[PDB]
Enzyme design. Sequence first.
Site, PDB file in Angstrom:
ATOM      1  N   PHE A  90      40.030  93.798 -75.151  1.00  0.00           N
ATOM      2  CA  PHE A  90      41.006  93.383 -74.120  1.00  0.00           C
ATOM      3  C   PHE A  90      41.904  94.552 -73.689  1.00  0.00           C
ATOM      4  CE2 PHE A  90      40.180  89.665 -76.785  1.00  0.00           C
ATOM      5  CZ  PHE A  90      39.851  88.712 -75.849  1.00  0.00           C
ATOM      6  N   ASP A 139      44.949  75.339 -76.695  1.00  0.00           N
ATOM      7  CA  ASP A 139      45.894  75.830 -77.725  1.00  0.00           C
ATOM      8  C   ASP A 139      47.067  76.575 -77.089  1.00  0.00           C
ATOM      9  OD1 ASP A 139      46.969  76.137 -80.276  1.00  0.00           O
ATOM     10  OD2 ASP A 139      45.681  77.836 -80.768  1.00  0.00           O
TER      11      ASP A 139
HETATM   12  C1  RHZ Z   1      48.340  90.320 -80.515  1.00  0.00           C
HETATM   13  O1  RHZ Z   1      48.070  91.227 -79.429  1.00  0.00           O
HETATM   14  C2  RHZ Z   1      47.041  90.915 -78.589  1.00  0.00           C
HETATM   15  C3  RHZ Z   1      46.213  89.840 -78.817  1.00  0.00           C
HETATM   16  C4  RHZ Z   1      45.155  89.577 -77.950  1.00  0.00           C
HETATM   17  C5  RHZ Z   1      44.302  88.372 -78.192  1.00  0.00           C
HETATM   18  C6  RHZ Z   1      44.365  87.654 -79.379  1.00  0.00           C
HETATM   19  C7  RHZ Z   1      43.554  86.545 -79.574  1.00  0.00           C
HETATM   20  N1  RHZ Z   1      42.722  86.079 -78.641  1.00  0.00           N
HETATM   21  C8  RHZ Z   1      42.641  86.763 -77.481  1.00  0.00           C
HETATM   22  N2  RHZ Z   1      41.789  86.305 -76.584  1.00  0.00           N
HETATM   23  C9  RHZ Z   1      43.400  87.925 -77.227  1.00  0.00           C
HETATM   24  C10 RHZ Z   1      44.922  90.446 -76.878  1.00  0.00           C
HETATM   25  C11 RHZ Z   1      45.747  91.541 -76.655  1.00  0.00           C
HETATM   26  C12 RHZ Z   1      46.805  91.752 -77.514  1.00  0.00           C
HETATM   27 CL1  RHZ Z   1      47.817  93.127 -77.333  1.00  0.00          CL
HETATM   28 CL    CL Z   2      42.810  73.879 -81.388  1.00  0.00          CL
END
Ligand code: RHZ
Ligand code: CL
Length: 329
Positions: A90, A139
């Site tokens: 991401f 969620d």
């Molecule tokens: C905790 O930091 C993040 C968490 C996610 C994250 C965390 C969990 N699921 C998704 N889809 C994205 C993406 C970018 C950042 Cl910086």
């Molecule tokens: Cl859930």
Amino acid sequence: VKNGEKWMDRYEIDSLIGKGSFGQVVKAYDRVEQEWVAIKIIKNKKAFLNQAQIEVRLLELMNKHDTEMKYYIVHLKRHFMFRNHLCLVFEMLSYNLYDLLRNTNFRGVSLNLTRKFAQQMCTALLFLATPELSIIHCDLKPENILLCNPKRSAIKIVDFGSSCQLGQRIYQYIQSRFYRSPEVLLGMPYDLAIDMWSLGCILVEMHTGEPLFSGANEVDQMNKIVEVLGIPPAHILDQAPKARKFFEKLPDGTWNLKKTKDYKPPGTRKLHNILGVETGGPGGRRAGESGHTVADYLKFKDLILRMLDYDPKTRIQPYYALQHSFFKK
Ligand SMILES: COc1cc(-c2ccnc(N)c2)ccc1Cl
Ligand SMILES: [Cl-]
Ligand SMILES: [Cl-]
């Protein structure tokens, strides 16, 4: 995983950002794009891999739809398999809206900042409701909403780990308890309206500092909802597989609470008083601040009560939420 470790002559791992039921999220330098990225590393177990494969599919589906409404969702850049872990890459985002509340000592952000969050989230939900997407986040909560930039009030939704398209439901028991919709508590088939319920709960919390409905279990959860909103309507309870977990029907055609050992009477914990509409906002802490007049508060209350309609059929939808007076200059 360890700092300085280099993957596939491309990514240099820096540090742990986050941990989930799904695995872990690390900060990493991408030498190809020359930028920092967040890599979500899924646990190497069938259960977590298979659910993360659904998450990848739903994010790639969203990426194939270029329109103004799609830029409130975290951007998946790509994914690969490594050491038998599915890895989702991401963009980097900043800290989450729970951290924001913790930073206010749980006294909440202004109605003006609450409004800015509401407008972005309603726009994201409008995007997910695109017919060919029909994606239910499942969620939504403060922790799953991240600031784009610590200097700014732009946000994106993360964690499509629970998400499903309409008619591709897997689990009956979904959503984080505090943000769980009446239809999910009642064991009923759910649709995109469960996200709008979560959002209503989230916006009150962002302004008061505190969860609207902090149930210690499902029975406590439903009891806390009933304190504010009253007994759910009979037409919903008559169709609900789990209605008798919480309620009892009487000869009259009427429902009321099952009680255990010793809540306020149904519908008497007024959102009017939680928000402090006529009493200077939550705990009177906004007395005299600009943007916190009775008129501004009444509009906010009206929008939240439309988001907290028991009936998912009549609960306000994202397009209509965006046309609400709360959002008019
Ligand atoms: C905790 O930091 C993040 C968490 C996610 C994250 C965390 C969990 N699921 C998704 N889809 C994205 C993406 C970018 C950042 Cl910086
Ligand atoms: Cl859930
Ligand atoms: Cl929370």
